């Protein structure tokens, strides 16, 4: 009966459920002895049945999962009603769900996700304005018109926006000398003053307008090889409204031919202030660059993820490797090959977008201590993902449904109030909120009225039929009140026999009951009414208490399902008893404690394999011709399992053959064939001789 609930010594019903879900608390506790405490009330559901009495009053609540709404996503995108508006169509089926958490019970739900066939795309193009990328600018002017046409096939709603990020103005990054300031390049060449962050234009439905703005843009340059693209990218995401971000998937195109400075690179610059991730742009110009130091890569990931802006990197083969390492850090982003003059920029964007769309990942909200989440996913072509692979599926085409079972476990009842949290994948405005209302109350406790006069005018909580004595009260009635001013005649209830020590000399006696004295080596308080039982007074099988695996109960070793005996180390395993022949303990004997006890006379050995005195097999095993066939005598096929061979006049004269007399007094020739170790082959001559 050893379990956490019993070990917990549950004071009230609420503790039986908290200690173990299987354990149930009987309010009636009729079976429970008055002397026995509240712990004895709590018992396993299977264990309660062991008693043979079932209590209706006992409460065993089980956690359940419910759903507030069950909306249906449009299927096949057919008809005017389907995809009527962005808010109107929801990819996620269940908007939110409600479940009940029970300690020791897992809770899993099914989430149905299907890709929407039609979804608008917004494309913000961040292009390095460095002198090396000049050639790229001329192509980017005629690119916008080509882009719009290609993206129209991909999506019936495409918006093009141009962004120009160079580097933060500082004495070290860019030449302080005023002559260079006017133009970063040589005097003969024409280069515009460097600007760390500038907006050429916002997102528009017409690509032609974009073309005109690109042409006005003038080539710029920076002294350092790495450019401050990171600062420009961060500003775009945080502002949002400025870039005119919409629910339509946003491709964060980022094209540069050089490296990127990150985190506290301002140090040489002398700026010790980190980026605040806030919008300070004025007239499409960010002038807080010499105020805030370049933001860290982790900080940039937090912003892009928060605004769900897909990040696509279009960099040259020289810096390709560096950007690939960064890719793992920033999610919902891709890396493609960039031409010297951005000739294949349009081809990259198209390919990059397809890869990002196929990969879908689920992210949940911050969870309090004692709360965990498990992900189980379903994929096409028989591919199953677990752990990290379980959370995100891949190779998802338009109109393809993928489901993700999520398991949430809540224990310790930390918060009584309901916890509401929201879970959503990157690039998807639609989210899923799982709300949980923890129940830690007791139905009987609600029914139970405080200060009940039955239990000595409420001295002990009398909820339902269960009476739990309060501090200073021991028993069913708790009419003791411990020590009093007028000394009483000890406690008659404490000792069955007055002559014997109060509570069998095992503890302190009060309120007409017995609380056993604490023991450091074993469970402090012993079991029993008179505390006469003990948890460390049992026998040891071999230097280990109760076989080393048994549980001591009232100074009595109880063995496990695999053990039997006072020692309790005696296993029920008969594997050691078995021999090569295949009969337990050879021919005869009883397998007890893993050591065969030979029964048949003059049988010695571990499996009693040595019986020299024992009569010869041919003589003793004469039942093979008289039990299988010509049935007569005793019994049967348990011992003589050897196969009979139909051999006539076999030349095997001495293995050693044997001869006997039959019913008609006819000689019978037979033998048992053994060549190596133990072998079994019977050769009884069919042809009879009289």
């Amino acid at each position: 009966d050893e379990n956490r609930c019993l070990k917990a010594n549950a004071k009230s019903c609420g503790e039986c459920i908290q200690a173990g879900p299987n354990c149930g608390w009987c309010t009636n506790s009729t079976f429970l002895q008055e002397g026995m405490p509240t712990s004895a009330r709590c018992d396993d559901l299977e264990a309660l049945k062991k008693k043979g009495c079932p209590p209706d009053d006992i409460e065993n609540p089980r956690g359940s999962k419910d759903i507030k709404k069950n909306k249906n996503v449009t299927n096949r995108s057919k008809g005017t009603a389907e995809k009527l508006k962005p808010e109107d169509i929801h990819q996620i089926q269940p908007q939110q769900l409600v479940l009940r958490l029970r300690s020791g019970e897992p809770q899993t739900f099914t989430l149905k996700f299907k890709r929407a066939e039609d979804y608008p795309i917004d494309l913000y193009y961040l292009m390095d304005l460095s002198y090396s990328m000049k050639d790229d600018l001329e192509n980017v002017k005629s690119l916008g018109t080509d882009l719009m046409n290609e993206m129209r096939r991909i999506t019936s709603d495409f918006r093009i926006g141009f962004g120009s990020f160079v580097e933060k103005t500082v004495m070290p990054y860019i030449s302080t000398t005023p002559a260079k300031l006017r133009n970063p390049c040589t005097s003969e060449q024409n280069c515009t003053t460097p600007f760390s962050y500038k907006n050429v234009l916002s997102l528009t439905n017409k690509g032609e307008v974009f073309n005109e703005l690109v042409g006005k843009q003038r080539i710029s340059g920076n002294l350092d090889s790495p450019e401050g693209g990171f600062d420009a990218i961060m500003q775009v995401a945080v502002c949002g409204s400025l870039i005119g971000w919409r629910n339509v998937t946003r491709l964060l195109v980022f094209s540069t031919d050089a490296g990127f400075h990150f985190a506290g690179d301002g140090k040489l610059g002398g700026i010790v202030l980190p980026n605040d991730g806030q919008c300070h742009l004025e007239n499409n110009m960010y002038t807080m660059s010499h105020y805030y130091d370049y933001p860290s890569i982790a900080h940039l990931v937090q912003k892009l993820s928060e605004n769900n802006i897909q990040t696509i990197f279009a960099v040259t083969e020289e810096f390709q490797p560096v950007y690939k390492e960064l890719k793992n850090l920033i999610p919902k982003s891709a890396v493609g090959t960039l031409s010297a003059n951005s000739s294949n920029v349009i081809q990259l964007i198209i390919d990059a977008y397809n890869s990002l769309s196929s990969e879908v990942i689920l992210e949940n909200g911050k969870l309090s201590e004692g709360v965990t989440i498990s992900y189980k996913s379903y994929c096409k072509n028989g591919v199953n993902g677990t752990g990290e692979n379980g959370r995100k599926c891949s190779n998802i085409s338009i109109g393809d449904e993928v489901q993700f079972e999520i398991s949430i476990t809540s224990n310790k009842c930390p918060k009584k109030d309901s916890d509401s949290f929201k879970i959503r994948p990157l690039g998807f405005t639609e989210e899923v909120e799982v709300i949980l209302q923890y129940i830690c109350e007791c139905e009987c406790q609600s029914e139970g009225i405080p200060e009940s006069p039955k239990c000595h005018e409420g001295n002990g909580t009398f909820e339902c039929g269960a009476c739990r004595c309060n501090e200073g009260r021991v028993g069913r009635h708790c009419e003791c009140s411990t020590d009093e001013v007028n000394s009483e005649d000890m406690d008659a209830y404490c000792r069955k026999e007055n002559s014997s020590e109060i509570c069998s000399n095992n503890g302190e006696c009060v309120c007409g009951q017995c609380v056993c004295r604490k023991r450091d080596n074993t469970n402090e308080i012993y079991s029993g009414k008179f505390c006469e039982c003990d948890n460390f007074n049992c026998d040891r099988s071999n230097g280990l208490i109760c076989g080393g695996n048994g549980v001591c109960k009232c100074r009595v070793c109880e063995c496990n399902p695999n053990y039997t005996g006072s020692a309790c180390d005696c296993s029920l395993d008969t594997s050691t008893c078995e021999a090569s022949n295949g009969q337990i303990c050879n021919g005869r004997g009883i397998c007890e404690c893993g050591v065969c006890k030979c029964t048949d006379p003059k049988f010695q050995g571990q499996t009693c394999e040595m019986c020299q005195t024992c009569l010869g097999v041919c003589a003793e095993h004469k039942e093979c011709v008289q039990c299988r066939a010509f049935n007569k005598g005793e019994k049967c096929t348990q011992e003589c399992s050897y196969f009979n061979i139909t051999k006539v006049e076999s030349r095997d004269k001495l293995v050693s053959h044997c001869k006997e007399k039959d019913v008609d007094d006819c000689w019978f020739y037979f033998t048992y064939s053994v060549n190596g170790n133990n072998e079994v082959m019977v050769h009884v001559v069919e042809n009879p001789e009289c």
Binding site: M171, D224, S225, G259, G270, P274, I297, S487, N542, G543
Partner: protein, 905 residues
């Protein structure tokens, strides 16, 4: 916990001057000790200079109300008139504006170096803007001012060391050697430059602004791939070589393609001895560096700070946890993989930004190290973590946490920006720690206090107490009192001769929870006694003797439970003010609580005296030990007590050999059939404890029969030793005389010999089978068996031996002639015998040796005697040459056997 964070000294600097950026100790001890604080954006009086920056020195005073900035530069930036005459007016050759002087402050002895990297110089011949970087060297109590421009050179633009920012990170060696590392030279590759104080002063020339020194040592030039490595970002001095020359520790933040590595380079060799590579990508490994011995082996260990490390929590959300690294140097080799690491929970902690050696703060024999978290804390004020020194490794958990007393403001405090430690400001024998807070423009220094270790030990000699007789009787009522006395000792360094302490004694503490207090002090008539005791550092422990009396009333129903005596003390809260000003402290390891239990003497005697005289006599049955046999040894011991009662928990423990194992115990006493016996594995030798009884009974004699199994143990190499003794919990004469019984172990063998004849192609088959079985448990090698019949296996021979098997055997005559097939007494001696001597080496317990002899009868020979009864007889003797045992003092098994076979017609 030694540092006095509660009242840290505060240094005041002008707002916006970035006061507290860099703080270091210069010329500590001797005449006077002063604190230097860097003021880089600090407004200077220099003409034409804006936000030049300055270093402020504050003389140690009970109150730091006075702080004077060091006058490093008393003149304006130099302008050359010759070029100015040719040109229109005058143009600044160099700009002192935004110099950020004081960004680094290093002081060795009387020499102080203040360098601002942002400071630049315009080329005289043509105008070029580059961060060359400057410094100001002060020595001999500011006797001679020297200006050193190492990064300054003819080489100009990205190609030259014109952006070097020399002095960004500067460290002084133990010899006062200057080490300036700049991260902007050679297209921002970085360059570490070092020169001695004497060489730099001699090389420096006032007339020529740009000068060169012969024998100057700097870092080597690197390729375009090595560019933007930011070499020298953080410099430190550490010794791993063990040579007189001191190695330079300088981590790269943007090195190894933005991964960041730390390289240790010897100034004389101008090369890197060993390099450390960061695991976390964009780790920024080398942002903060430090060299000190943190494990007490006398070998410098290298610490590196990576606050940009972004770790992943159980939820999976990404936070800038960061990691602090430190590696304990070994003589055999230097391990790259970090032995220990530090992880910061604080999201955006930025921890490990500044690291400062603190010497041995706890005087534990291990040096400690402070780490700075600029954006640490709930209010993001900033925090500094002090980790305790450990010989195996520095403890992961911080020893103490320091939080700024001042209320948080909207402007980031940036605490832990600069950390200085390992130098004793007041020479109290405990290293101090000064923290830089440039955001609040203040400077905070934390003083320490000495730790004193004490020990409380309460011992009661007259614990035995009986209420029948009271030694002390009061006028009101009689109540016997047990003499109670507790001794306390105190020792330490930098503590007063007399130290105030607070002793507190509790009687029946486990009965103080609403229970009737059994024992009370006789003098104050109360259970508790708190007291003050002045204890000298070198004085012997003083034990104050007190008398505690137990009550004699029928009020308490239960008195079975023993009285509990608890002594608990602590340093007095109102400690007397000391000249040093540091309050005394008590070490956590020392225990200031001693717990004792007193049990009333029950039925001791008329005089209440308990004296047991246990007697023990033991013997062993079946004493002979057969090696290799399942020997059973029953221990027979008669235990008796001719002494008085009070020997509580009497128990006989028989220490077993490795060989012997316990099965059970049977006694003769009527009350208990089987005495309880529990295993005691903790005892070095297996010991079985059987309780004779709960309360000792005078004249209680108990005969105990213990059966012990003997699992094989041939490694004993002598007679097994079993020790029998009686143990008691009594204060005096607790144990009985020890009884040691030696059990002789002598292996014995027993080989049986049994022979029978099957009788008892011409000639009926005759089978003679001789079998030897080693019934005895001792297997014997080299068993020799001599088999012999009365025929030579010839033709005139009546019998024809065919073969013999089951043991290897050699026959003098051919065993196989050609191929595998009144009464006359035919016996070996009568005719030609055919003796065959066999030999069997491999033998085991219960092994059966059986030799089958099958000599057929020669028909022609038999026909020689037509009507004669023949009786064939074959004999066999055997022996055993030796047995495989360490000792064999017994008889070696031997025997003989005959076999007969009659023939009739």
């Amino acid at each position: 916990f030694n540092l006095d964070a509660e009242a840290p000294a505060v240094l005041s600097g002008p707002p916006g001057s970035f006061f507290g950026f860099s703080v270091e100790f210069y010329r500590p001890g001797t005449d006077g000790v002063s604190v230097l604080v860097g003021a880089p954006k600090a407004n200077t009086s220099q003409p034409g200079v804006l936000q030049g920056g300055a270093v402020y020195l504050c003389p140690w005073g009970a109150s730091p109300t006075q702080c004077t900035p060091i006058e490093f530069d008393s003149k304006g930036s130099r302008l050359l008139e010759s070029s100015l005459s040719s040109s229109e007016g005058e143009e600044p050759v160099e700009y002192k504006s935004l110099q950020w002087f004081g960004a680094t402050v290093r002081a060795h002895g009387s020499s102080i170096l203040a360098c601002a990297p942002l400071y630049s110089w315009r080329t005289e011949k043509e105008p070029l803007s580059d961060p060359v970087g400057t410094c100001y060297l002060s020595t001999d109590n500011f006797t001679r001012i020297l200006e050193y421009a190492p990064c300054r050179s003819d080489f100009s633009w990205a190609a030259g060391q014109g952006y070097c920012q020399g002095g960004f990170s500067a460290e002084f060696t133990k010899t006062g050697r200057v080490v300036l590392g700049g991260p902007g030279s050679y297209f921002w590759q970085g360059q570490i430059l070092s020169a001695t104080q004497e060489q730099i002063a001699e090389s420096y020339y006032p007339e020529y602004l740009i000068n060169l020194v012969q024998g100057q040592l700097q870092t080597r030039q690197a390729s375009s791939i090595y560019d933007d490595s930011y070499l020298g970002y953080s410099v430190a001095v550490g010794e791993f070589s063990g040579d007189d020359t001191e190695d330079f520790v300088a981590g790269v933040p943007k090195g190894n393609l933005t991964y960041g590595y730390v390289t240790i380079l010897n100034g004389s060799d101008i090369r890197s001895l060993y390099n450390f590579s960061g695991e976390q990508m964009a780790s920024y490994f080398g942002y903060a560096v430090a060299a000190t011995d943190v494990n007490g082996d006398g070998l410098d260990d290298l610490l590196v700070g990576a606050p940009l490390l972004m770790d992943r929590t159980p939820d999976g959300r990404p936070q800038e946890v960061g990691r602090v690294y430190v590696y304990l140097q070994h003589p055999a080799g230097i391990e790259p993989t970090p032995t220990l690491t530090l992880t910061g929970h604080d999201e955006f902690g930025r921890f490990g930004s500044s690291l400062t050696p603190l010497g041995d703060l706890d005087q534990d024999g291990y040096n400690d190290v402070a780490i700075g978290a600029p954006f640490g804390g709930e209010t993001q004020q900033g925090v500094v973590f002090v980790f305790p020194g450990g010989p195996g490794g520095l403890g992961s958990k911080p020893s103490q946490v320091l939080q700024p007393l001042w209320a948080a403001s909207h402007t980031p405090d940036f605490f832990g920006s600069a950390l200085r430690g390992g130098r004793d400001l007041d020479g109290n024998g405990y290293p101090d720690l000064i923290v830089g807070s440039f955001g609040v423009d203040k400077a905070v220094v934390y003083r320490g206090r000495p730790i004193v270790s004490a020990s409380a030990s309460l011992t009661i000699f007259p614990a035995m107490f009986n209420p029948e007789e009271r030694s002390c009787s009061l006028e009101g009522n009689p109540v016997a009192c047990i003499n109670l006395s507790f001794c306390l000792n105190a020792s330490g360094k930098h503590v007063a001769d007399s130290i105030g302490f607070t002793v507190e004694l509790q009687l029946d503490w486990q009965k103080q929870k609403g229970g009737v207090r059994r024992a009370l002090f006789l003098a104050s008539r109360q259970a508790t006694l708190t007291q003050t005791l002045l204890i000298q550092n070198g004085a012997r422990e003083d034990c104050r003797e007190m008398k505690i009396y137990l009550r004699n009333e029928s009020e308490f129903r239960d008195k079975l439970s023993p009285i509990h005596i608890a002594l608990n003390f602590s340093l007095d809260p109102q400690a007397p003010v000391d000249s040093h000003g540091l309050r005394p402290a008590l070490h956590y390891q020392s225990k200031s609580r001693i717990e004792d239990k007193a049990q009333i003497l029950l039925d001791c005697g008329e005089d209440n005296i308990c004296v047991p005289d246990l007697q023990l006599e033991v013997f062993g049955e079946q004493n002979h030990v057969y090696l290799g046999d399942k020997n059973a040894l029953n221990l027979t011991f008669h235990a008796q007590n001719v002494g008085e009662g009070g020997a509580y928990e009497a128990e006989l423990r028989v220490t077993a050999p490795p060989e012997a194992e316990y099965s059970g115990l049977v006694r003769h006493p009527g009350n208990f059939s089987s005495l309880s016996c529990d295993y005691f594995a903790v005892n070095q030798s297996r010991l079985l404890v059987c309780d004779l009884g709960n309360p000792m009974k005078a004249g209680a004699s108990l005969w105990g029969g213990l059966r012990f199994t003997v699992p094989h143990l041939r490694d004993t190499k002598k007679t097994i030793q079993f020790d029998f003794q009686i143990l008691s919990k009594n204060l005096n004469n607790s144990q009985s005389d020890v009884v040691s019984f030696r059990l002789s172990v002598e292996a014995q063998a027993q080989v049986t010999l049994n022979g029978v004849s099957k009788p008892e192609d011409l000639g009926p088959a005759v089978h003679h089978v001789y079998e030897l079985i080693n019934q005895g448990p001792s297997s014997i090698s080299q068993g020799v068996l001599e088999l012999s019949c009365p025929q030579a296996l010839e033709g005139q021979q009546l019998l024809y031996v065919t073969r013999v098997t089951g043991l290897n055997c050699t026959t003098n005559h051919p065993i196989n002639p050609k191929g595998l097939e009144g009464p006359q007494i035919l016996k070996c001696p009568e005719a030609e015998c055919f003796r065959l001597r066999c030999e069997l080496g491999p033998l085991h317990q219960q092994e059966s040796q059986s030799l089958q002899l099958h000599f057929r009868v020669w028909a022609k020979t038999f026909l020689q005697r037509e009507h004669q009864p023949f009786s064939l007889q074959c004999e066999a003797v055997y022996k055993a040459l030796k047995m495989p045992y360490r000792i064999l003092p017994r008889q070696l098994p031997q025997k003989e056997r005959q076999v007969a076979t009659a023939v009739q017609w």
